[PDB]
Each structure stands twice: as structure tokens, then as C-alpha cells.
Amino acid sequence: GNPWTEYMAKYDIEEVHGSGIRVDLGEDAEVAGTQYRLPSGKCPVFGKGIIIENSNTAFLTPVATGNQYLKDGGFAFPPTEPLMSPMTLDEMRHFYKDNKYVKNLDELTLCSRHAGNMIPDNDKNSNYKYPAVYDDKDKKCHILYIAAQENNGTQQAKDIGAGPVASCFTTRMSPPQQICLNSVVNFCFRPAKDISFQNYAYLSKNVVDNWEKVCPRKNLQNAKFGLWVDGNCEDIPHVNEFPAIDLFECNKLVFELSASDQPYKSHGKGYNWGNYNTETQKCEIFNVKPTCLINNAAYIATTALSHPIEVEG
């Protein structure tokens, strides 16, 4: 007897996303006998990036390679021959022009599939696929070489997402081609929604083709998450109030408290939702799936997955 069922489906994080948000390590994959953790969420995480502590290096900088003094880098794939990352949207469309399955794929899905094309060469039967970040401003897809997302002070490295030490990769696309790093690969960090990440989307290998329709992106203006009980949309019974100067800060707080696979698997369970009161500047965070919306002109409904700025009616 709930008329909101279909509308609210995209806010059922456990179902539509199915993995952690702050830290997504929801699946395991073997590469040459060794198990690794890797992101597996089905929805893009809008505005998510990685902040490297004691550094000005943007995390989309390619991972450091070589042995040079002051060697420094980020998380993205280093140069390869041919160059696989970063790749603009038009370069991806031209690169896959002979693959008729990539037609009509939107920017984010194409980027996730591009990142999933590289197989750690030591195991052709491996399901290991690297995650990616799409920059909607420059229209660039960055394949992440490091799948780890948090390290604030070996198996314990594997437990945070340390990927396989891989220098050569085989493409899943046919005809197969082997692509190796031009050099050998050799810090503490945390995920966050920083204002400088506003145009970024963090993408696991599992981002679904139809994310635009099933996943949350825009925050809901004049709306408040509730629970459907006996013909009425009741308030969430238990919330944690936090001060938030605007919607962005509230979305940032929801993201920090959201489902996390950091040491093991949340499967999407967590403080993933927030009702932001724009009059009292309060962020009301909760960990129960909402099943209806309340009409309240002072509220904006947000989720950890949602873009931290964009709103809709």
C-alpha cells in the first residue's frame, strides 16, 4: 500500500548499489592464485575523490614510477604504449569504434568499461577490473592503478585494496593486445568529497549501463526522506543531527559516515542518507532505507552517492 515504491527504488542503496560508498571493496578477485579486494558498487559515487595527506599531489596524478629522487605520484595508471589512461571521451569513442557494443553508452559507463578492459597479465581468466574516475569537466577517463581508497596507519595492505603488482596487461577486447607500463611501479590517504572533486565520479567495474535511471544523482529539493507507515510518510525514527552550513557540507558528512568496506564488507549498509534542513542548517543522517518522501519546504534530501551540489524538483 505504498505509492512511493517505484520512485524510492533508487534510494535503496543496499539493492541498487550493493557495496560500500566511502570505501568500496565489496568483491574479491584472484590474480594468479592471490585474492585481492576491489570496488564493486553498481552506482557512480558523485564528487568522491582521494586526499593524499602531507601532499599537494592530486590523486588523479599517475602512480609514481622509476627510482628518481623525489619520486611522487597519485593513483592513476602510468603511461603505457599505446596510452590507455587518461583518455578523453572522444578518444574512447574512437578507440572502441570497431566495438559495436559501446554504441549508445553514456560517458560514465564507457569510462568504467574502458578501465575494465585491462587484465592483470598474470591471469587471463581473472575477473579483476580496475576502478576509474571520470572528470565531467575535462571529459576525461582516468583508470586507477591503485584500488585502495583509505590508508591512515602484506595482507593488511591487501585488506585495504592494495592491488596486484602488475607491469603488463592484456585487453579483454579482441583482437587481444598486451600493454605494459613504460617503467616499473614503486603514503597515507583518505576518501572525501572535496569541492575540487565536484566534477568527478568514482566508478567501480560494476557501474550499470542504466545508472541514470536506477541510481541517485540529484538531491531532492523541498523533500525529506521518510518511512511509509499506515498510509502516512513518517519521519525517520532515529537520526544523528550535525551542523552543516549548506547542502555540500551535509552531503560531505553523509559520505564520511556512509557504508564503508574498510577493515569487512558492508554490502551497502550504512549511514547513507541525509535530510538537510536549510533553515536550521542541520544535517540529519540515518542508516535505514527511506521508503517515501515528506513535503517540507525547508529540507533537501541527499545520499552519500548523490552529487554534493546538484538539486532537482
Numbering used by the authors: 7 to 159, 177 to 209, 219 to 295, 300 to 349
Quote the authors verbatim.
Additionally, we created insertion fusion immunogens by inserting RON2L into an AMA1 loop proximal to the RON2L binding site. Immunogen 3 lacks only amino acids 265-KDESKRNS-272, retaining Cys263 and the disulfide bridge. The disordered DII loop was replaced with a Gly/Ser linker in both of these insertion fusion immunogens to prevent the potential displacement of the fused RON2L. In contrast, insertion fusion immunogens 2 and 3 retained the RON2L binding mode of the complex but displayed local distortions in loops near the vicinity of the insertion sites, resulting in Cα RMSDs of 0.381 over 232 C-alpha residues and 0.309 Å over 228 C-alpha residues, respectively. However, the IC50 values elicited by the insertion fusion immunogens 2 and 3 were 1.5-2-fold higher (i.e., less potent), and they were significantly different from that of the AMA1 DI-DII-RON2L complex (P < 0.005). Similar to AMA1 alone, the insertion fusion immunogens 2 and 3 produced potent strain-specific responses but were ineffective in inducing a broad immune response, possibly due to the insertion of RON2L in the DIf loop. This insertion results in a loss of strain-transcending functional activity, suggesting that either the local structural perturbations introduced by the insertion fusion disrupt strain-transcending epitopes or epitopes within the DIf loop contribute to protection breadth.
The malaria merozoite protein apical membrane antigen 1 (AMA1) is critical for RBC invasion and is one of the most promising blood-stage vaccine candidates. Here, three single-component AMA1-RON2L immunogens were designed that retain the structure of the two-component AMA1-RON2L complex: one structure-based design (SBD1) and two insertion fusions. We determined the X-ray crystal structures of SBD1 and insertion fusion immunogens 2 and 3 to resolutions of 1.80 Å, 1.85 Å, and 2.10 Å, respectively.
